[PDB]
Design a protein around this nucleic acid. Sequence first.
RNA 1: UAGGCAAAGCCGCCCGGUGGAUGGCUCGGCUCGGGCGCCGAAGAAGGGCGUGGCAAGCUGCGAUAAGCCCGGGGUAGCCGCAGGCAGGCUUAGAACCCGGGAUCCCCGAAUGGGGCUUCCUGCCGGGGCCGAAUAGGCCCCGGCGCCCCGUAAGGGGCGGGAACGCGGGGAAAGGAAACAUCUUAGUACCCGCAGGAAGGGAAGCCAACAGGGACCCCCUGAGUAGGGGCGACCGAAAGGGGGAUA
RNA 2: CCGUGAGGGAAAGCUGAAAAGAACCCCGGAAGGGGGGUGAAAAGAGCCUGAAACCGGGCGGCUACAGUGGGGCAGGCCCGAAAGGAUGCCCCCUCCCGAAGGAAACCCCGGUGACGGGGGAGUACGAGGGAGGGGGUCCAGGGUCUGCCCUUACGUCUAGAAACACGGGCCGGGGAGUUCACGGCCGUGGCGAGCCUAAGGGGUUCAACCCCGGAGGCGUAGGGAAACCGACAGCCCGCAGCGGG
RNA 3: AGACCAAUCAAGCCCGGUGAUAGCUGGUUCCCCCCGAAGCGGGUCUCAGCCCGGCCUCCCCGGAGGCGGCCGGCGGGGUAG
RNA 4: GCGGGGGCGGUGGGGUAAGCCUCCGCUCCGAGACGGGAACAACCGAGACCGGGGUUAAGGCCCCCAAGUGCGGGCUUAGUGU
RNA 5: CGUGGGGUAGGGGGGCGCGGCCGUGGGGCAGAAGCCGGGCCGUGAGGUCCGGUGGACCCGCGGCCGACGAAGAUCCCGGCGGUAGUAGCAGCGAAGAGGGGUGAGAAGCCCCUCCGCCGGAAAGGACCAGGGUUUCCUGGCAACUUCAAUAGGCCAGGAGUUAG
RNA 6: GGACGGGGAACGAGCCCCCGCGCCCGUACCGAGAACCGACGCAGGUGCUCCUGGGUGAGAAGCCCAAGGCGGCUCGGGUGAC
RNA 7: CGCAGGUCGCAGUGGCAAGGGGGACCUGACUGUUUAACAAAAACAUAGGUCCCCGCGAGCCCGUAAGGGUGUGUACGGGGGC
RNA 8: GCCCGGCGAACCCACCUCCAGGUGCACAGUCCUGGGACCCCCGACGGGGCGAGAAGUCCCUAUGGAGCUUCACAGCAGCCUG
RNA 9: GACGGGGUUGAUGGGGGGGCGGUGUAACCCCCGAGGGUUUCCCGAGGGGAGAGCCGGCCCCUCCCAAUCGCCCGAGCGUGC
Length: 183
Amino acid sequence: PHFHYSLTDEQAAELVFKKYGVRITPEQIAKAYAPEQRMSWKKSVEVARFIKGMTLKQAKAWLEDVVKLKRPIPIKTFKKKQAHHATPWEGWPVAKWPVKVAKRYLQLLENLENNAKFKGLDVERLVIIHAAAHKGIKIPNIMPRAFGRATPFNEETVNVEIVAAELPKEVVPKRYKLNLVKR
RNA sequence: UAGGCAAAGCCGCCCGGUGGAUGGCUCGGCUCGGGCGCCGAAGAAGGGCGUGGCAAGCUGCGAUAAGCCCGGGGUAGCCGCAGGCAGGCUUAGAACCCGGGAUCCCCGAAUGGGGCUUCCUGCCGGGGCCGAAUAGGCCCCGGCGCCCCGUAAGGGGCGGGAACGCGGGGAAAGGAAACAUCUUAGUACCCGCAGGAAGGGAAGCCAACAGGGACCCCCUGAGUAGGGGCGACCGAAAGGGGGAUA
RNA sequence: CCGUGAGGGAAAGCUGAAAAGAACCCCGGAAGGGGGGUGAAAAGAGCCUGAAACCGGGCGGCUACAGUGGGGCAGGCCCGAAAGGAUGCCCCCUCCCGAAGGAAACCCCGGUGACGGGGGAGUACGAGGGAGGGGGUCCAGGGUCUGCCCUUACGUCUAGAAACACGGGCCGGGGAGUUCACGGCCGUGGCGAGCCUAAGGGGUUCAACCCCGGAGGCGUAGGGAAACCGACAGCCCGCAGCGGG
RNA sequence: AGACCAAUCAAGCCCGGUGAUAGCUGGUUCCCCCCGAAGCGGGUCUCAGCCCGGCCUCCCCGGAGGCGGCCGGCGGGGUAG
RNA sequence: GCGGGGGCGGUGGGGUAAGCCUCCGCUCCGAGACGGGAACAACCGAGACCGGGGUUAAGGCCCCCAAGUGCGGGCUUAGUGU
RNA sequence: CGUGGGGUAGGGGGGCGCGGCCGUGGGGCAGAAGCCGGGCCGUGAGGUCCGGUGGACCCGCGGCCGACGAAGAUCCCGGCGGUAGUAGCAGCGAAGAGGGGUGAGAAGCCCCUCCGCCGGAAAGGACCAGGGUUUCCUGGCAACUUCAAUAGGCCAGGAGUUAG
RNA sequence: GGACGGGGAACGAGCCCCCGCGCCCGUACCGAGAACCGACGCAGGUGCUCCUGGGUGAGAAGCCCAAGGCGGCUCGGGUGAC
RNA sequence: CGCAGGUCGCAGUGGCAAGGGGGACCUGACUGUUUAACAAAAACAUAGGUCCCCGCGAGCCCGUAAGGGUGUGUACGGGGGC
RNA sequence: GCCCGGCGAACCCACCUCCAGGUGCACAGUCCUGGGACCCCCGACGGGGCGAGAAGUCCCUAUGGAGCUUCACAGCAGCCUG
RNA sequence: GACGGGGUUGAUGGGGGGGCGGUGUAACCCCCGAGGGUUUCCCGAGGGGAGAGCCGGCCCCUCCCAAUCGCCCGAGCGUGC
Ligand SMILES: [Mg+2]
Ligand SMILES: [Mg+2]
Ligand SMILES: [Mg+2]
Ligand SMILES: [Mg+2]
Ligand SMILES: [Mg+2]
Ligand SMILES: [Mg+2]
Ligand SMILES: [Mg+2]
Ligand SMILES: [Mg+2]
Ligand SMILES: [Mg+2]
Ligand SMILES: [Mg+2]
Ligand SMILES: [Mg+2]
Ligand SMILES: [Mg+2]
Ligand SMILES: [Mg+2]
Ligand SMILES: [Mg+2]
Ligand SMILES: [Mg+2]
Ligand SMILES: [Mg+2]
Ligand SMILES: [Mg+2]
Ligand SMILES: [Mg+2]
Ligand SMILES: [Mg+2]
Ligand SMILES: [Mg+2]
Ligand SMILES: [Mg+2]
Ligand SMILES: [Mg+2]
Ligand SMILES: [Mg+2]
Ligand SMILES: [Mg+2]
Ligand SMILES: [Mg+2]
Ligand SMILES: [Mg+2]
Ligand SMILES: [Mg+2]
Ligand SMILES: [Mg+2]
Ligand SMILES: [Mg+2]
Ligand SMILES: [Mg+2]
Ligand SMILES: [Mg+2]
Ligand SMILES: [Mg+2]
Ligand SMILES: [Mg+2]
Ligand SMILES: [Mg+2]
Ligand SMILES: [Mg+2]
Ligand SMILES: [Mg+2]
Ligand SMILES: [Mg+2]
Ligand SMILES: [Mg+2]
Ligand SMILES: [Mg+2]
Ligand SMILES: [Mg+2]
Ligand SMILES: [Mg+2]
Ligand SMILES: [Mg+2]
Ligand SMILES: [Mg+2]
Ligand SMILES: [Mg+2]
Ligand SMILES: [Mg+2]
Ligand SMILES: [Mg+2]
Ligand SMILES: [Mg+2]
Ligand SMILES: [Mg+2]
Ligand SMILES: [Mg+2]
Ligand SMILES: [Mg+2]
Ligand SMILES: [Mg+2]
Ligand SMILES: [Mg+2]
Ligand SMILES: [Mg+2]
Ligand SMILES: [Mg+2]
Ligand SMILES: [Mg+2]
Ligand SMILES: [Mg+2]
Ligand SMILES: [Mg+2]
Ligand SMILES: [Mg+2]
Ligand SMILES: [Mg+2]
Ligand SMILES: [Mg+2]
Ligand SMILES: [Mg+2]
Ligand SMILES: [Mg+2]
Ligand SMILES: [Mg+2]
Ligand SMILES: [Mg+2]
Ligand SMILES: [Mg+2]
Ligand SMILES: [Mg+2]
């Protein structure tokens, strides 16, 4: 099957202009998709929200640190009964270390970087402008319980879409922006 | 003071993911009308197993196994559902359709005898094989059920079929605003027995002094007579009109 | 497929006209992704359309000193192309008419007084209905938020439901006064001291339709258990109507 | 021990009679307009039901009187005191 | 429909009494919006087609809250009371 | 004309919608039904039009007929939520570690070394019923194993049971 | 298997040597804290049904160790609050 | 299996393994059985005692019937109560 | 248990609720009058939500059952008798 | 989560040395040993002497190792009363 993106190329260009103030063409846009990943969908949503707005190299470095358990991912929405931790950012104490999600996102970012290179864009000036994760289909299963009943035990897959744009280096950020209250 | 100015969160629209509603479709169902109507010891229906070059299921077929022969129709394509890969068949007339034949494993009324495993096993006759042998042994084929009719030869019954038919055995729930007679109902259901229909059928009739004229089925007589805790409720027949006519 | 068994028993339709079923390039361990193609259209084999619930992102409004949903009025921000008006809307001014209602200063009479009365004055004004002048751009409508005013989820039994009475997590689809016989009645239609045919028969363009079929049913007369018997235009009151004054 | 007879026993299970019956409980789907109740009396194995009247609604016939009020004439009554 | 209920009156009759049982009459709720009563079916006012203007009813007029820190006389010292 | 305008149960009167039939008049590949948002009309049931999507049927009017209108039945079927990235993946007296190899990827697969558990046995030998290919070999990881996997009673292909 | 009897032939063995035949069906694997039943790769049930070396020991007890097998009663790490 | 001597510890069946004991009442003699899944008991059974129907073509019981059980039995017996 | 990595449900759910004193189908999150609260997140508990589970088995009603009893109303086998 | 201290102008954790402390006297060596035998140079439970030995989630001293390299947040401007 074919999975569409939530944002077309012209809307991506409009968002790029509205967020940075430069005008770019569809040829400066690179997309990647990872359909039906077997991982946590809530943590996938959190990771996509965090990595939106970084450059590709910044996102890759942070995801590698996440996989090495050296930098956490902030949990803003799916935070019920989740512990507090010391964080490298400011404004939010709920952090996790999603390793499986981080590896799948690293594979997706590798595909996106290859697509940008094939289109001929400079990878050092590629900024992530759109990132989304959706609940895909379910691989169902049953867990037997006491007293002869059986309850659902499902693997809810994830579809991840990412779109990045090649921007002028005078507008591309040079460091992480880690004030999540303002972010 | 307020804006730049934002957490988590809330509302509305748009796009995406999920989902499979809606709409359109239909080689399916349902109802009604008409026809046609038995199969089985010449071994049936039903079941098991098998059967395709790649084939699991369905369909078909039966070790000759999606098949064999003959005739008629049908001409150029064909090898089912089923749109793949090969290799073939066919103009010496295939496929396909119709009629007639051949084959038709095991179990099955199953019928030589068993059957706690759809498989096993006996006696007799003939045949084959191992074997030095004509011994002994093993294998193949045929016959061997019960009850009957018939002098014998020979023949009959058995099982199945969606519903309908005939004979017998035969409830309760419910209703009666309780409940027993009653009803439900001669029903449900059970046992037995037939046919393409069955059963019925040719006046020891009906009538009323006038006359009909075997039988079945339809319309009516009629919810009338009558039966009945005369309650619920049940319930004709003669006669008349038709189908048909023996 | 379930049960030892007698028995019981689902879910599940749709590519395209044609596979033209997606060549080729980059990445990926692979599912697969990007680019590039076929096709009128991806309609992509997870295959017509593709709703809502639900989840993600963007946008608009709010967002940490203020207690929530619904309604009315006023406002802030945002949309307002079409289908609505723009001959609109709003402001100001002026003019005219104007229902019920209806002042004030001031003068006069009274009361300790709050106040009453005569005049001012049925006056100024007053819902609304007409006309014109200038100024401006949208107005209606929609989303969200704020202020003020109003406001005790739904369905149900009940005298009494917001109830500490019971039912529903949400959304989609499904889901309940039917038909026959008989009887009573009503609204109409046909015929009328008569009305209708039933079964069935003939024809047909063949279950329609045309014709036949009066058997029988109900009405035309009642009383009585039954035997048995078996019926009106005479008088008065008087609505309508007609005639007379 | 009314134990057990296939997770079933003060009388198994399967299919059928069977859509058993239920005065009882739950549900019963679109809009506007006109009128608009009752929980009273009597009977009932009647008291959570039903029938006959009172109360509602609609249609028709009928034909001029009717009465939740008051004054007066002529009457009834046996309560408060 | 044949379960009624509230207020007031019959010292109704009963009962210690009861938001208690059982009769009689008007009205209201049930089946009736709305104003007042701090909320509140039946207490007071009052009966609602829709929109607007005005005036009143119950009740209120220091603030909450529209309308009076209104007027004359007298009493209360208990925040009694409102 | 009305000192007309509340109303449950219930009675009476009219209308909207859905599927089809008898007529009649039309629309449609220059885009039908359906779906999403919006404007206008109507007290209302509802109607109609605009923009997007979609891809072949549909509609106005008169008459007639119904398997004809849902918010609810601890309703039926299906899908999907919050709960929540939460409970559980402890208890029944065993458990792992180092190095190497394979591999995209290794705490967990293969080999060695160390450590441990059973040893008249939840554990070593045999084997009945029942199961029926789970046995063996090769390859693999879409699904299965309460985590992983390159492992496997799993998936695919092939093979295997010899009697006086 | 033996014995006790009847009948028959001229041959002839339970001893030695040599020759021939023995059909049909089962036969893999688990046999259970994952191959059976219990909806499950289920702490239950079926089957511990039958068998098992050394030390200590009354002991087929317990504890330790052979033969033999296992780390698959199929989550891992950190922390050392209640 | 025993005797003599020496000697250590808090502890010598040093771990493992491994009875607390006694008096009195009620009650059922005892061993045994019981409500699979809330009752293990004083409940049931029991040996012992006693009564009744029965001489067999019996008594008692089952079957529609054909017939059957007690009975391949016989009063030191079969059946039925307490 | 808590924290990290991996897998990943269920119950329950009209919407969802700070406290006091009232009112009301008489035991209010939603009504009245007050008192308070910056918002969000973690852990724990079990006072409240007349918390959840189960159309209350307790009581009554129904002209509803089932089983058992007999001196109920009837009936049928069985046995005895003519 | 937080909080507190140190972070090379440093004694923050470890190593080493010292102090203090727990247990109880290791190894080696020498003496005795009930009694037996290879007669008395052997065995032998065990006692004695010197030596303690082991250990410290405490204190001091000492830069021997590591407190590094790095990653971020952050006011700045207008408006009206
Ligand atoms: Mg179970
Ligand atoms: Mg998952
Ligand atoms: Mg926010
Ligand atoms: Mg056959
Ligand atoms: Mg046979
Ligand atoms: Mg026959
Ligand atoms: Mg019936
Ligand atoms: Mg009855
Ligand atoms: Mg009865
Ligand atoms: Mg005949
Ligand atoms: Mg005949
Ligand atoms: Mg009859
Ligand atoms: Mg589709
Ligand atoms: Mg416009
Ligand atoms: Mg216009
Ligand atoms: Mg109630
Ligand atoms: Mg009540
Ligand atoms: Mg009522
Ligand atoms: Mg209510
Ligand atoms: Mg109830
Ligand atoms: Mg509920
Ligand atoms: Mg008892
Ligand atoms: Mg029974
Ligand atoms: Mg039944
Ligand atoms: Mg009225
Ligand atoms: Mg009731
Ligand atoms: Mg009078
Ligand atoms: Mg008196
Ligand atoms: Mg009453
Ligand atoms: Mg009253
Ligand atoms: Mg009030
Ligand atoms: Mg005021
Ligand atoms: Mg009205
Ligand atoms: Mg029409
Ligand atoms: Mg309803
Ligand atoms: Mg459901
Ligand atoms: Mg969920
Ligand atoms: Mg976790
Ligand atoms: Mg846990
Ligand atoms: Mg052990
Ligand atoms: Mg051991
Ligand atoms: Mg074993
Ligand atoms: Mg294997
Ligand atoms: Mg293998
Ligand atoms: Mg397999
Ligand atoms: Mg074997
Ligand atoms: Mg297991
Ligand atoms: Mg042992
Ligand atoms: Mg070993
Ligand atoms: Mg393990
Ligand atoms: Mg753990
Ligand atoms: Mg012990
Ligand atoms: Mg005892
Ligand atoms: Mg005992
Ligand atoms: Mg028990
Ligand atoms: Mg017990
Ligand atoms: Mg006893
Ligand atoms: Mg005695
Ligand atoms: Mg006695
Ligand atoms: Mg009260
Ligand atoms: Mg509440
Ligand atoms: Mg109940
Ligand atoms: Mg109950
Ligand atoms: Mg009771
Ligand atoms: Mg009654
Ligand atoms: Mg019974």
